[PDB]
Design an enzyme around this catalytic site. Structure first.
Site: not given
Lengths: 48, 113
Positions: B28, B2
Site C-alpha cells: 500500500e 539500531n
C-alpha cells in the site's frame, strides 16, 4: 567536467498538451401535442 | 541507534503481525508515498521518543504525538524539512488510538499550512 545536456524525468513537462478538454450539457425537456383534443361530454348543441 | 531503528520498522510492520482498526499492507506504501517512481524515498520519523523520566510530565495523546511528528528537530534524517515542500505524509498508529482523533490531528497539521 561537462554535462552537455541533462533534464528531468517524468512529470508535468510531459503533460503540456493534454488539459484535458471539457464538454457541454443540455436539458431534458419536452412538450406534448394538444391539437387533437375536444370535450367528451357535449349536450349544449342540442338547443337545435 | 539500531534499537531505535528497530522500533520504526516494528511500527511499520505492526499492521501485518497483529489486528487493528485500519490495516496497512507493505504494498500500500508505494501508492501513497511515491507520486512518481523515482521520487520514491521518504524520510523517517517516530514518536514518542522519550525516557521514563519524562513520560510523567507530558500529555501523550494522539493529538500531541501526531503534532510532534512534524517538529523539524526530531526527524530521523538530519535536514530541516521546511527547506522544501511535503508531497505525501504516511502516518501509522499503534495502541490506544481512536480514529476520530487521528482524523482531528492530521486535519490540524494541514490547517497549519
Amino acid at each position: 567536467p561537462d554535462l552537455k545536456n541533462v533534464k528531468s524525468k517524468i512529470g508535468s513537462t510531459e503533460n503540456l498538451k493534454h488539459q484535458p478538454g471539457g464538454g457541454k450539457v443540455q436539458i431534458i425537456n419536452k412538450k406534448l401535442d394538444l391539437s387533437n383534443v375536444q370535450s367528451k361530454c357535449g349536450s349544449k348543441d342540442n338547443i337545435k | 541507534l539500531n534499537r531505535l531503528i528497530s522500533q520504526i520498522v516494528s511500527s511499520i510492520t505492526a499492521s501485518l503481525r497483529f489486528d487493528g482498526a485500519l490495516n496497512v499492507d507493505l504494498t500500500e506504501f508505494q501508492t501513497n508515498l511515491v507520486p512518481y517512481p523515482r521520487i520514491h524515498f521518504p524520510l523517517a520519523t517516530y514518536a514518542p521518543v522519550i525516557s521514563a523520566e519524562k513520560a510523567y510530565h507530558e500529555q501523550l495523546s494522539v493529538a500531541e504525538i501526531t503534532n510532534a511528528c512534524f517538529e523539524p528537530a526530531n526527524q530521523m534524517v538530519k535536514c530541516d524539512p521546511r527547506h522544501g515542500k511535503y508531497m505525501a505524509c504516511c502516518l501509522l498508529y499503534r495502541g490506544d488510538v481512536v480514529p476520530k482523533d487521528v482524523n482531528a490531528a492530521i486535519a490540524t497539521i494541514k490547517t497549519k499550512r
